């Protein structure tokens, strides 16, 4: 009966598991190295088996002979709904196995970042074996890049609190601060700068967060970046500075704050064009007037 219960759980045969339990099968039966039906269901992704077993008194924190719990197995195999059900039934979020890894680290092994984040929300402890720490810190990097583009301040704050490196970058050279400025997320710009983000990080085309905020016209982000030391005269690989971008795209208020913070009206891009020239070219007479008076 114990063998039948293990194999019915592995196969996801819910009504067969129900019958076996009703007929007295030990819900915490173990195979020869300590795997219980809940282990195998969690490994295999059979949520229905998981819920039936837990309803019938299964030990949510059963260990096999390597110290793995059902939450370890569900994390490693990427079964998010089972992770949630296990946690809701008292699974130990910080259970550690015989080599020191917890469910968060096994989830990171195959890139199961939503599970990593869920485990963080449920108390996953973030304080040679630094390989374990790298698993966490890399997952946090990827999560922070994702969260910074998305825009939710609470999510980013949580990831930074957990140890995410605010100065990481994606493969194009966009840091979280670039992404937050690009997408117009002022709240995340503020949080990143409060936590040590390089205000003048360059992507591979020489674009700083201030280039991106001037390009997109986000005045409040421009102002916060300038208050934190953004390079008002930084140039991209074609010589374009923030004042050029604000003039090209008709952002009069951004031209004004850039000028207040020391922007150089005489800077020429690689084509010899000053911000005034570009204002003229684009029919932005009001901006051209401001720049000529500041010449």
Residue numbers in the entry: 14 to 140, 157 to 324
How do the authors describe this structure?
In this paper, we present a strategy to fuse specific, high-affinity protein binders to obtain multivalent or multispecific scaffolds of predetermined geometry. DARPins are used as building blocks to confer the desired specificity to the construct. The two helices are not just joined end-to-end, but instead the two domains are made to overlap in such a way that the joining helix is stabilized by contacts with the domain cores along its entire length.
In the context of DARPin-β-lactamase fusions, we observed that the paratope of this DARPin has a high propensity to form major crystal contacts, leading to crystal formation under a wide variety of conditions. Indeed, constructs D12_Hxx_D12 with H02, H09, H11, H13 and H15 yielded diffraction-quality crystals in space groups P212121, P6122, P212121, C2 and P1, respectively, at resolutions ranging from 1.8 Å to 3.5 Å. The observed pseudo-torsion angle of 172° is close to the predicted angle of −176°, but the connecting module is partially disordered, such that the C-terminal DARPin is rotated 90° around its long axis. Two such dimers pack into a barrel-like unit. The purple molecule in Fig. 5b shows the C-terminal DARPin packing against the green N-terminal DARPin, the pink molecule the N-terminal DARPin packing against the green C-terminal DARPin. Only a few structures show a kinked, disordered or dissociated shared helix (e.g. D12_H09_D12), but even then the DARPins stay fully intact, demonstrating that local perturbations of the structure in the helix region can be accommodated without unfolding the DARPin moieties. Occasionally, the DARPin fusion constructs would rather distort the conformation of the connector module than forgo the formation of such favorable crystal contacts.
